[PDB]
Ligand binder design. Structure first.
Ligand SMILES: *[C@@H]1O[C@H](CO)[C@@H](O[C@@H]2O[C@H](CO)[C@@H](O[C@@H]3O[C@H](CO)[C@@H](O)[C@H](O[C@H]4O[C@H](CO)[C@@H](O)[C@H](O)[C@@H]4O)[C@@H]3O)[C@H](O)[C@H]2NC(C)=O)[C@H](O)[C@H]1NC(C)=O
Ligand SMILES: O=C(C[C@H](Cc1ccc(O)cc1)n1nncc1CNS(=O)(=O)c1ccc(-c2ccccc2)s1)NO
Ligand SMILES: *[C@@H]1O[C@H](CO)[C@@H](O[C@@H]2O[C@H](CO)[C@@H](O)[C@H](O)[C@H]2NC(C)=O)[C@H](O)[C@H]1NC(C)=O
Ligand SMILES: *[C@@H]1O[C@H](CO)[C@@H](O[C@@H]2O[C@H](CO)[C@@H](O)[C@H](O)[C@H]2NC(C)=O)[C@H](O)[C@H]1NC(C)=O
Ligand SMILES: *[C@@H]1O[C@H](CO)[C@@H](O)[C@H](O)[C@H]1NC(C)=O
Ligand SMILES: *[C@@H]1O[C@H](CO)[C@@H](O)[C@H](O)[C@H]1NC(C)=O
Ligand SMILES: *[C@@H]1O[C@H](CO)[C@@H](O)[C@H](O)[C@H]1NC(C)=O
Ligand SMILES: *[C@@H]1O[C@H](CO)[C@@H](O)[C@H](O)[C@H]1NC(C)=O
Ligand SMILES: *[C@@H]1O[C@H](CO)[C@@H](O)[C@H](O)[C@H]1NC(C)=O
Ligand SMILES: *[C@@H]1O[C@H](CO)[C@@H](O)[C@H](O)[C@H]1NC(C)=O
Ligand SMILES: [Br-]
Ligand SMILES: [Br-]
Ligand SMILES: [Br-]
Ligand SMILES: [Br-]
Ligand SMILES: [Br-]
Ligand SMILES: [Br-]
Ligand SMILES: [Br-]
Ligand SMILES: [Br-]
Length: 915
């Protein structure tokens, strides 16, 4: 070659300059041996990778980061020039691409398997990536060290050199070495353990199935487990720090139930013999779906019924399903590349609806799934949005791809799709895909084909439409042309950024339809809006009922404008029944008036997921410049009779969000008025709430929400109960049991005095439930004294009292509250060098810190400081897609304030004037 590029550590040229690995050498079986100490806090290790060469080469490229490689031999069974003992390979490290090059003495012969073998060693990492160190406090006050592995997406290479791209699937055989005082876990169960010369044990795990690197796990710790067996015979075990074993019972119960449901629903036995869920304390990700060894942070798995909320339970249930789901969606079938990551997470997130709704209908989680979409829409409604699958190449660009577009928008379009096809056709399509790609990879296209080409019961009858020798019928031509329709449809939902807005004018019996990209911060008549609607066009599966019928009219819209005729001229039409469709409806003409009519009158004539959607749509149109605020505010008057905790709780959110908004600026005039409307118009529901744990899950949530509202507006009777419960709690030395649904309210009332604040900080360190610890930390952030809040973030940087994994979470709390809002923003700026040392630029921690302290700003002055800060960041190495999204969010807040604030002031003064 031209010797042109590039120079390796040691100064010789590297024979490779692509960021992606070459594909000429393919791995079959990794033979891994890991020997960590945990008093050295380091490890030595060896690996034998059995590899197939296809195009002949004189060098191998594979990933290795921050690993001291010190042997590297090459043996072959078939190319007998490298017969055992084998030959040695020259090793080159190109750290800039996290790659290494092994240099052969003779070109490798195509179509022959070789065995690549290196020895290596590294200190145990100390930063929640790779093979890293992590600790936990016992009930006695003992701190214990565990050594655990988190690899997704590109961190496997930090713990053993390997082909660290998810398409390179392989079998792994993991051997661990450990003192007798520790146990060793990995992906597969444990075949043999041999006692060795110095009383050290060596654990020998069953050989993994074909699997991607980033899923390998191995833990060395001393936890205790709780076990049960599924209908299928899987040995589920909930693993946890030994004094918390009695907090694992729910987890086991639910995962037994869940793991069963999945198996039946997918029609694919979970392959492995065991499955282990382990609750780790120093766990930066919420939970890692490592095949057979799913690691959760304690708050995402454990459950203390004395201190865990009802919503805490639902959260644990959701996460356990989410991880379980990945066993199929992610692990059996895996994305070709990270560009199609939502095939992994966006399915897992849709499934937790399906699965929870099937196993804990008690938890009413179907009534909560619409938040998952409403959340993302606020971000798909910005030019800053990305398509579901977008190219990504850097480690950072990958990390970046786990935002809410992959999780949430992926989840919602699936639920949209499913409601297009009905769940029995939609499940048969999910099976035909997990089966077809078992132990392989799929890309975006692969899925849409396999869902598009559904089969209702593979009827395989005398002439089943699917399978064997079918019959050539009128339906079959509908089938195949209706199938191509749904693949050609969902292809636009995954390749176009953003979210459509359907305009609906009613013209007597004729209904006219327009489609356009819904956008915020920008009106229609703005000079920048004609330029963002240009080529966006979806295939939007519409639905609608009307005032005169509940039948579900279904029509596909594949064009920029369309009109539908209608019979029995109705009072009003409701589009997008139940808000299952990933789109917003704006009724032109008297449309928005006529629906508000129905809600203000009988109101049951609209079905509750309509009201939830209508409540939602009405307000975003206000933020689209389409509706004067007073229309959305007038919908909330109906909430007085809203029987449905969901729609009540939503309409309530907006009315509360305004308050926090107004409070962050000294807009006390609207601030007080918003309080007075909240406590006086919703007084009948606030006052009948109980200070207890009783009621259904939605009943409980509506208690905590309202009791928090009341104490955040300082309603003396509701502050007084919390003061008194708090004092009783503190005078019992923690022994009195506060109801869980009141547990956070009581602490942050108690945090409001420095005696209370101090006792809570002391109690944080002594608590045996992460669940409680978390509520106490919210209480501490509730403080109005800056020196206290600053101590909190000071303790967060030390990682001892408050672990750093909650420091992003902590900052965000502090910055939400007005007293600490500048303090957060100022802190992040003054220590941005120090935050980068603790956290990867692509981490969820850093992204949350950024938007956590800035995205609530609603002033042109703070926008400048934010633009200025992000500029400085771009000038250095740092570049994140979040920077734009934050600025477009602040800009949307400035514009929404400019157009709407005086409407909110007159609306509220008008209400006072009527009553
Ligand atoms: C992690 O590292 C720790 C220390 O860093 C290590 O523990 C040490 O193990 C060694 C043996 O490997 C222990 O030393 C032995 O103690 C026993 C006590 O029963 C004696 O019988 C031994 O005497 C013989 O061995 C010596 C060398 O091992 C010879 O010099 C001697 O002449 C005898 O032949 C010997 O003293 C040592 O006590 C521990 N230390 C601690 C603090 O535990 C541990 O094994 C490592 N673990 C893993 C998993 O790698
Ligand atoms: O899904 C996953 C990883 C993600 C975590 C992740 C990490 C980095 C990143 O850049 C994006 C997401 N996760 N962890 N628990 C559930 C989920 C998915 N539900 S989530 O709503 O999207 C969600 C994201 C973060 C959550 C959390 C968890 C505990 C405490 C507070 C917040 S909860 N593994 O399988
Ligand atoms: C690597 O894992 C694969 C699973 O993907 C193993 O393949 C199975 O092997 C058994 C035993 O030979 C067969 O009966 C199964 O039908 C295979 N299943 C599939 C899906 O291929 C394979 O044995 C593993 N390889 C090694 C070397 O352990
Ligand atoms: C949640 O589970 C419920 C059952 O608990 C599902 O409701 C059933 O839906 C089928 C098909 O729509 C009906 O034939 C049954 O009569 C329903 N059972 C009821 C209403 O008790 C519901 O479809 C599930 N939701 C989701 C989103 O999967
Ligand atoms: C080797 O690489 C070339 C690149 O053009 C490809 O066409 C070929 O199919 C590969 N495999 C062989 C030659 O076996
Ligand atoms: C490689 O490992 C073997 C034992 O595994 C050792 O004999 C040898 O000295 C090591 N290094 C070199 C450079 O040969
Ligand atoms: C088990 O959990 C209960 C209730 O959450 C708790 O009160 C108890 O202290 C735990 N067991 C022990 C031995 O501490
Ligand atoms: C919207 O994003 C696209 C992405 O290429 C860009 O070209 C365009 O200028 C952006 N528009 C605005 C108003 O930021
Ligand atoms: C709404 O109409 C239904 C159907 O006739 C009726 O049962 C219900 O009492 C009505 N509610 C009100 C408030 O008029
Ligand atoms: C609002 O006014 C109070 C008056 O006591 C003042 O102390 C406070 O700093 C002001 N807050 C802001 C954000 O201007
Ligand atoms: Br089954
Ligand atoms: Br992650
Ligand atoms: Br997290
Ligand atoms: Br945790
Ligand atoms: Br939840
Ligand atoms: Br009260
Ligand atoms: Br601001
Ligand atoms: Br301003």
């Amino acid at each position: 070659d031209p010797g042109a590029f590039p120079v390796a550590t040691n100064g010789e040229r590297f024979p490779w300059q692509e960021l992606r690995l070459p594909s000429v050498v393919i791995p079959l079986h990794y033979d891994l041996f890991v020997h960590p100490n945990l008093t050295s806090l380091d490890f030595v290790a060896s690996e034998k990778i059995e590899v197939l060469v296809s195009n002949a080469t004189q060098f191998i490229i594979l990933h290795s980061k921050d690993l001291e490689i010190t042997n590297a031999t090459l043996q072959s069974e078939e190319d007998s020039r490298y017969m055992k003992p084998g030959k040695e390979l020259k090793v080159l490290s190109y750290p800039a691409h996290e790659q290494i090059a092994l240099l052969v003495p003779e070109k490798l012969t195509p179509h022959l398997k070789y065995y690549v073998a290196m020895d290596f060693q590294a200190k145990l990492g100390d930063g929640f990536e790779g093979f890293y160190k992590s600790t936990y406090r016992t009930l006695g006050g003992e701190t214990r060290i565990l050594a655990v592995t988190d690899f997704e997406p590109t961190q496997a290479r930090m713990a053993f050199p390997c082909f660290d791209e998810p398409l390179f699937k392989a079998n792994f055989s993991i051997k661990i070495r450990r003192e007798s005082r520790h146990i060793a876990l990995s992906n597969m169960p444990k075949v043999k353990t041999i006692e060795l010369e110095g009383g050290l044990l060596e654990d020998h795990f069953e050989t993994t199935v074909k699997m991607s690197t980033y899923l390998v796990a191995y833990i060395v710790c001393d936890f205790h487990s709780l076990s049960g067996f599924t209908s299928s015979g899987v040995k589920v075990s909930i693993y946890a720090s030994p004094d918390k074993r009695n907090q694992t019972h729910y987890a086991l119960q639910a995962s037994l139930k869940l793991l069963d449901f999945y198996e039946k629903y997918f029609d694919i036995y979970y392959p492995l013999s065991k499955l282990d869920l382990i609750a780790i304390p120093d766990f930066a990700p919420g939970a890692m779906e490592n095949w057979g060894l799913i690691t959760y942070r304690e708050t995402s798995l454990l459950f203390d019924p004395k201190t865990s909320s009802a919503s805490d339970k639902l959260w644990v249930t959701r996460v356990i399903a989410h991880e379980l789901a990945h066993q199929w969606f992610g692990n059996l079938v895996t994305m070709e590349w990270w560009n199609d990551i939502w095939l992994n997470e966006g399915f897992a997130k849709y499934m937790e609806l399906i699965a929870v709704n099937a196993t804990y209908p008690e938890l009413q989680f179907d009534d909560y799934f619409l938040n998952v979409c409403f959340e993302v829409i606020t971000k798909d409604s910005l030019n800053s949005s990305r398509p579901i699958s977008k190219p990504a190449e850097t480690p950072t660009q990958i990390q970046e791809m786990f935002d809410e577009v992959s999780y949430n928008k992926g989840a919602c379009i699936l639920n949209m799709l499913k409601d297009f096809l009905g769940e029995e056709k939609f499940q048969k399509g999910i099976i035909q895909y997990l089966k077809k790609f078992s132990y392989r990879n799929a890309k975006n296209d692969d899925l849409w084909s396999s869902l598009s080409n559904s089969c209702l019961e593979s009827d395989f009858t005398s002439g089943g439409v699917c399978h064997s020798d079918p019959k050539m019928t009128s339906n079959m031509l509908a089938f195949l042309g209706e199938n191509a329709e749904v693949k050609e449809m969902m292809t636009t939902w995954t390749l176009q950024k953003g979210i459509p807005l359907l305009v609906v004018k009613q013209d007597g019996c004729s209904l006219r339809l327009q489609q356009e990209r819904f956008l915020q911060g920008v009106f229609q008549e703005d000079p920048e809006w004609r330029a963002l609607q240009e080529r966006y066009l979806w295939h939007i599966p519409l639905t609608y009922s009307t005032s005169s019928s509940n039948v579900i009219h279904r029509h596909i819209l594949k064009s920029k404008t369309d009109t539908l005729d209608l019979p029995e001229k109705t009072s009003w039409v409701k589009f997008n029944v139940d808000s299952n469709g990933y789109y917003i409806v704006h009724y032109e003409g008297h449309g928005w008036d006529q629906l508000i009519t129905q809600l203000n009158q009988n109101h049951t004539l609209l079905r509750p997921k309509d009201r939830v959607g209508l409540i939602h749509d009405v307000f975003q149109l206000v933020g689209a410049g389409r509706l004067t605020l007073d229309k959305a505010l007038d919908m909330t008057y109906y909430l007085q009779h809203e029987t449905s905790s969901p729609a009540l709780l939503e309409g309530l959110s907006y009315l509360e969000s305004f308050y926090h908004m107004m409070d962050r600026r000294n807009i006390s005039d609207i601030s007080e008025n918003l309080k007075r409307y909240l406590l006086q118009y919703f007084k009948p529901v606030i006052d009948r709430q109980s200070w207890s744990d009783k009621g259904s899950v939605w009943d409980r949530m509506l208690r905590s929400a309202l009791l928090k509202l009341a104490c955040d507006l300082n309603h003396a009777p509701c502050i007084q109960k919390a003061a008194e419960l708090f004092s009783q709690w503190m005078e019992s030395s923690g022994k009195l049991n506060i109801p869980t649904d009141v547990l956070k309210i009581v602490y942050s009332v108690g945090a409001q005095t420095t005696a209370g604040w101090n006792y809570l900080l002391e109690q944080y360190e002594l608590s045996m439930s992460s669940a409680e610890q978390n509520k106490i930390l919210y209480a501490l952030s509730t403080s109005k004294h800056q020196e206290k809040l600053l101590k909190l973030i000071e303790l967060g940087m030390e990682g001892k009292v408050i672990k750093t994994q909650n420091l992003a979470a902590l900052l965000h709390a502090i910055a939400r509250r007005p007293k600490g809002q500048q303090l957060a923003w100022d802190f992040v700026r003054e220590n941005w060098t120090h935050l980068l040392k603790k956290f990867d630029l692509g981490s969820y921690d850093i992204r949350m810190i950024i938007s956590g302290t800035t995205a609530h700003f609603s002033s042109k002055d703070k926008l400048q400081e934010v633009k200025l800060f992000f500029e400085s960041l771009e000038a250095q190495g740092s570049h994140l897609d979040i920077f734009q999204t934050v600025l477009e969010t602040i800009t949307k807040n400035i514009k929404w304030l400019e157009k709407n604030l005086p409407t909110l002031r007159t609306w509220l003064m008008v209400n006072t004037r009527h009553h």
